[PDB]
């Protein structure tokens, strides 16, 4: 067999951040934007506690692409983008990477490389009128499909055929937007659903959002498990002589393996050396 050294301690180094991310105002909002003009909010420089997310209704969908919900408290993303809107029931399947349809093409398109989470919950008791909730509209006609995360709020009359419209609707000249008719008596596939899309991006720049993972003391010259801003690994941390430029955070080897890391708190450089190992 092959002998290896086993770790003795586990250390976590997270940024010294106290503020709590404003997920309550994103989720417990009085109104949600229309799908064609979905509301985008930037979340950064705060501690993101997702353990409270489930505290807003019995989630109908919590599909996470690239990560898992149970692990969301152990990661350190860089920027969070929260896009909130309202759609219908059967249309909720269109909010996913590599999808097609009315919402995917003309309202909200998710890139194929999407990494994040999608939340949808039924909101028939909030966004339905017995006479019809006409506050929510979706685009029905466009020249071409949308680029990922592109918002189209134009309301110009759509010209389909060769006949000019001159700004007057009618045959061959349809109004681009069509309004939802949410009612309390509609079917589940037609009832309103509130959708919040979180778009994480990892690595690169220093992480500004992090989970509620406590940071322990930093120990060097020992074979330990380490977790630097979501970067997990095993090895021995040692002082570095590297000319790490101020912006540079971590260094890579020939095999693109993290070999030097900048401590998120002390802003000091640490070389990572794999624990002694070999064959017998």
């Amino acid at each position: 067999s092959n002998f290896r050294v086993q770790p003795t301690e586990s250390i976590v180094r997270f940024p010294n951040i106290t503020n709590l991310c404003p997920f309550d105002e994103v989720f417990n909002a009085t109104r949600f934007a229309s799908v064609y003009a979905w509301n985008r909010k930037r979340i950064s420089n705060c501690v993101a506690d997702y353990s409270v997310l489930y505290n807003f209704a019995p989630f109908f969908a919590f599909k996470c692409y690239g990560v898992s919900p149970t692990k969301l408290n152990d990661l350190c993303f860089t920027n969070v983008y929260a896009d909130s809107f309202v759609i219908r029931g059967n249309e909720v399947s269109q909010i996913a990477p590599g999808q097609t349809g009315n919402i995917a093409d003309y309202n909200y398109k998710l890139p194929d490389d999407f990494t994040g989470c999608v939340i949808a919950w039924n909101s028939n008791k909030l966004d339905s009128k017995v006479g019809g909730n006409y506050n929510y509209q979706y685009r029905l006609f466009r020249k071409s499909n949308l680029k990922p995360f592109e918002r189209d709020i134009s309301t110009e009359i759509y010209q389909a055929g060769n006949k000019p419209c001159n700004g007057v609707a009618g045959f061959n000249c349809y109004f681009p937007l069509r309004s939802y008719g949410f009612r309390p008596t509609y079917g589940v596939g037609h009832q309103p659903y509130r959708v919040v899309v979180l778009s994480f991006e990892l690595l690169h720049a220093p992480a500004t959002v992090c989970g509620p993972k406590k940071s322990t003391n930093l120990v060097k010259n020992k074979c330990v498990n380490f977790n630097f801003n979501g970067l997990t690994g095993t090895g021995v941390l040692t002082e570095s002589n590297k000319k790490f430029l101020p912006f540079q955070q971590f260094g890579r080897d020939i095999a693109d393996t993290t070999d030097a890391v900048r401590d998120p708190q002390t802003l000091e450089i640490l070389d990572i050396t794999p624990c002694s190992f070999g064959g017998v």
Epitope: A33, S34, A37, N39, K129, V130, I153, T155, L177, S179
Partner: antibody
């Protein structure tokens, strides 16, 4: 500037008919719902009816006391809204306002059933 | 139709005072409630939309809150130009009904 000039108000005998007009300017009349609201002398506001935009089907809703007597019409050509009332009684006297339900297509948070802009109001009196 | 009641209907206060107007609906109307201000001899003006959103051009001293069957309009610091009649209007149903009307006067 958004303006809603009204005309056609006046006095009428019981059982008569008048044709109120409300000409809109300064905004896209096509995309805005138009509602009629009346205020009895010394009383609170009462809702008369509503006509939706042509892009939403143009269905017309009326209050219970005025369902079978009033008729709300619109013409996008001259950006004008019309309220036709017939078979009046002594209880229909009030100051009638024409109101709009402009929808903000840009921001996204645009209400559709809020009286954003109001006309100056015209006085309609029913007497012998 | 939905029965809609205001409370109170004769409240008065002086300048630099806090005023709260309560508006109760006969059934759950979610957030479809609007607050209007009518000065004597003038057309009404929209103040609060969706029962929690300030309208553009309205001073920040007007605030809306509540949901379900209870709504409240709060004026933090009353002003000489804030004496008027306030109406709460529901849009949950197709038959829109206004409130009873609250008159805010001076002492």
């Amino acid at each position: 500037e958004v303006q809603l000039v009204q005309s056609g108000g006046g006095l009428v005998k019981p059982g008569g008919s008048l044709r109120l007009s409300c000409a809109a300017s300064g905004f896209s009349f096509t995309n805005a719902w138009m509602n009629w609201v009346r205020q009895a002398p010394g009383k609170g506001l009462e809702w008369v009816g509503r006509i939706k935009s042509k892009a939403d089907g143009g269905t017309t809703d009326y209050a219970a006391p005025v369902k079978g007597k009033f008729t709300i019409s619109r013409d996008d050509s001259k950006n004008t809204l019309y309220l036709q009332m017939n078979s009046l009684k002594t209880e229909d006297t009030a100051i009638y306002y024409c109101t709009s339900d402009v929808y903000d297509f840009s921001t996204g948070f645009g209400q559709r059933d809020d009286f954003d802009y109001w006309g100056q109001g015209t006085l309609v009196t029913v007497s012998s | 139709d939905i029965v809609m009641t205001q409370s109170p209907s004769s409240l008065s206060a002086s300048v630099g005072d806090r005023v709260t107007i309560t508006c109760r609906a006969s059934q759950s109307i979610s957030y479809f409630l609007n607050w209007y201000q009518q000065k004597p001899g003038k057309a009404p003006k929209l103040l609060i939309s969706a029962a929690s959103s300030l309208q553009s051009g309205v001073p920040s001293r007007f605030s809306g809150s509540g949901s379900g069957t209870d709504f409240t309009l709060t004026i933090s610091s009353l002003q000489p130009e804030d004496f008027a009649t306030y109406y709460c209007q529901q849009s949950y149903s197709s038959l829109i009904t206004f409130g009873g009307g609250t008159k805010v006067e001076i002492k």
